[PDB]
Write a protein that binds this DNA or RNA. Structure first.
Ligand SMILES: Nc1ncnc2c1ncn2[C@@H]1O[C@H](COP(=O)(O)O)[C@@H](O)[C@H]1O
Length: 169
RNA sequence: AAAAAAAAA
């Protein structure tokens, strides 16, 4: 019943998160991670629910909601970076229809299996064009590719390939 | 063109 909720605006507070998540169910605790001494926020926080059926509800309901201008990425807490660093179930999407946001991106790929974390990246002028979707399974990822890479999504043709970090790149 | 993230203070 622990949730990682990130992509937070450097000013979002534990109080604002409480007001945000409280509706999903009773909270055990909320904590926004900040730099040891400067206290500068680290752009993410833990939201601990009392009932996992609440944490799960909040995850399946408040995902992508905007706070102080930013869409929050919510996922089950998983402090071991191994999978993330190894992007095995992680795919890359290029050439998005701008009208395409996180939610839209989630719905389109969720069919292939459980996705751990997805984000359509945007900048001041919006949708920026691409994003990623980390599936819990590389079998899921394999099926996403192929069954999506190419075919037109919102008039536009998309490129779906394995993630490939900046180094490989 | 385009190639993310997470330090329980
Ligand atoms: N300080 C903490 N407060 C609340 N829950 C925690 C804390 N540290 C760890 N946990 C939870 O306990 C699990 C196992 O450690 C974590 O994955 C979290 O869900």
């Amino acid at each position: 019943a622990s949730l990682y909720v990130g992509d937070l605006h450097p000013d979002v507070t534990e109080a604002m998160l409480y007001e945000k998540f409280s509706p999903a169910g009773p909270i055990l605790s909320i904590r926004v991670c900040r730099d040891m001494i400067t206290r500068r926020s680290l752009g993410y926080a833990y939201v601990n629910f009392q009932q996992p059926a609440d944490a799960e509800r909040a995850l399946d309901t408040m995902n992508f909601d905007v706070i102080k201008g930013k869409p929050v990425r919510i996922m089950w807490s998983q402090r071991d970076p191994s999978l993330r660093k190894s992007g095995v179930g992680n795919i890359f999407i290029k050439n998005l229809d701008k009208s395409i946001d996180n939610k839209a991106l989630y719905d389109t790929f969720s069919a292939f299996g459980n996705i751990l974390s997805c984000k359509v990246v945007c900048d001041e002028n919006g949708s920026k064009g691409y994003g990623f979707v980390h599936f819990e399974t590389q079998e899921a990822a394999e099926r996403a590719i192929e069954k999506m890479n190419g075919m037109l999504l919102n008039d536009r043709k998309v490129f779906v390939g394995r993630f490939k970090s900046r180094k490989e790149r």
